[PDB]
Amino acid sequence: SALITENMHMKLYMEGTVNNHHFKCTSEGEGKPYEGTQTMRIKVVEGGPLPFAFDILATSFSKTFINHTQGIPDFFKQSFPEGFTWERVTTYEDGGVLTATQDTSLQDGCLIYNVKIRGVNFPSNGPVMQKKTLGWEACTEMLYPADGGLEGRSDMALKLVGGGHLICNLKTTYRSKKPAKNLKMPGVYYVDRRLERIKEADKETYVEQHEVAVARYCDLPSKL
């Protein structure tokens, strides 16, 4: 009856290109969906070492593991057993652009992610291609219902060697594989998110990554 249990496991396969460099990854992990925490152990299995900072792939390895507090209707957990998809455009302020499309199915009690990456115009002398990145700041995503699906908007800050940040923006469309007759859509809400790199080995051809993610309505006083 309940398909998303207290502890869930993941398998993931990813394939793409950045600028003109092909590659493939696999990853494997586990998390607690209702606590909104999760870990992925990732391997670059083709085309590594990558000639770009791994950070730009980070947001592409898990929407099921968000703590939907306050009885906010959970669009992603509801979509099972059919599952869902996301597609995203991340636009860097220094030219780089990264689209990704994703499929999330459930199979024998294991979440299965199939990702596809397409990056273009990352400046060759930029911090991404010259590997001067130190992971991401935390962020807030705004989700809102749109066309029987959900949309996400967010700005993210990539730390740089030397103190600075390079900023990017994310437009995400989330689509449920489940008939809209069976889904109870949420209002506008907000996910607070902290995505962190735990460990890495061999020039980022092995990376461990963690996320904590908690959904909430705006908690400030209203006057309307």
Author numbering: 2 to 62, 66 to 228
Reported in the publication:
Fluorescent proteins have facilitated major breakthroughs in modern molecular cell biology. They are widely used for studying biological events, such as cellular trafficking and endocytosis, and have contributed to the development of innovations such as multiphoton microscopy, genetically-encoded sensors, and super-resolution microscopy. mKate, a derivative of eqFP578 from Entacmaea quadricolor, is a bright, monomeric, far-red fluorescent protein with excitation and emission peaks at 588 nm and 635 nm, respectively. Structural characterization of mKate under different conditions revealed the pH-dependent trans-cis isomerization of its chromophore, a discovery that further aided the development of mKate variants with enhanced optical properties. Using a structure-informed approach, we introduced a minimal set of two mutations in the chromophore environment of mKate. The first mutation, S158A, has been shown to destabilize the trans conformation of the chromophore, whereas the second mutation, S143C, was intended to impact the cis conformation.
Mutation S143C may de-stabilize the cis-conformation by removing a hydrogen bond between the side chain of S143 and the chromophore. The chromophore in the crystal structure of mKateS143C adopts only the trans-conformation at neutral pH, consistent with the proposed role of S143 in stabilizing the cis-conformation and the spectral properties of the protein. The brightness of the single-mutant mKateS143C is more than 100-fold less than that of mKateS158A, consistent with a destabilization of the cis-chromophore, which was predicted for this mutation based on the mKate crystal structure.
